């Protein structure tokens, strides 16, 4: 037995059959998992996208996300896109809590983004809307640190997007880190930022 022992062994040339199939699943379950896990973000995102010219991005795990810009590894964070409506400007928002450039480690920089979202095409270009950038405190009234600024249509951050996102255009200078952490701006270890796109006087139906 060694010629037909392989006959009995043909049943072993079966192992690789069950095997090779199972492979097709760890693949899928993974791809699916990466997808399931993927559907989560999108579902955690669809729930938190403002539709009326304003934003309130809630930042937590703070002392975790500072030691990322401070010990360089996870510098900037972004909010969620917030539109003027459902089919318009996909204005995102990124935070440089430690800072970037002329306010890096001596200030907390926060800027206003503008994204490319289908309905850029039909909507008036270039961006030309007021954008009040403020900081929300958890405590009492607590002054809402931040300002706006009128878009200088010549700014290369207000064009009609051509790539996934735009050129930031906020303030590398916002709140001296020595004031942000010198308050309650980080209650329960969490901060909040309010964005305001002065839509006020705009052509309406």
């Amino acid at each position: 037995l060694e010629s037909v022992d392989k006959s009995a062994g043909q049943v072993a040339r079966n192992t690789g059959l069950l095997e090779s199939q199972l492979s097709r699943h760890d693949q899928m379950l993974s791809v699916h998992d990466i997808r399931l896990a993927d559907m989560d973000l999108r579902f955690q995102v669809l729930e938190t996208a403002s539709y009326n010219g304003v934003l309130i991005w809630k930042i937590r795990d703070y002392k975790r996300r500072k030691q990322e810009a401070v010990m360089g590894k996870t510098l900037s964070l972004y909010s969620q896109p917030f539109y003027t409506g459902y089919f318009g400007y996909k204005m995102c928002a990124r935070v440089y809590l430690n800072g970037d450039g002329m306010g890096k480690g001596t200030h907390l920089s926060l800027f206003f983004v503008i994204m490319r979202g289908e309905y850029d095409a039909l909507l008036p270009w270039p961006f030309k809307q007021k954008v009040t950038l403020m900081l929300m405190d958890q405590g009492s009234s607590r002054r809402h640190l931040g300002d706006a600024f009128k878009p200088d249509p010549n700014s290369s951050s207000f064009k009609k997007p051509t790539g996934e996102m735009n050129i930031a255009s906020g303030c590398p200078v916002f709140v001296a880190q020595t004031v942000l952490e010198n308050g309650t701006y980080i209650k329960d270890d969490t901060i909040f930022i309010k964005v305001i796109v002065d839509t006020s006087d705009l052509p309406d139906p």
């Binding site: 450039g101 890096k104 200088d152 249509p153 700014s155 290369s156 951050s157 255009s169």
Partner: peptide
């Protein structure tokens, strides 16, 4: 008669810090 703010630079490929002066 609007407002003159800051723009940014434009990313590259190599190591370096987010700068635009």
């Amino acid at each position: 008669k609007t407002a003159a703010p800051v723009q940014e630079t434009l990313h590259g490929s190599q190591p370096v810090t987010q700068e635009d002066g």
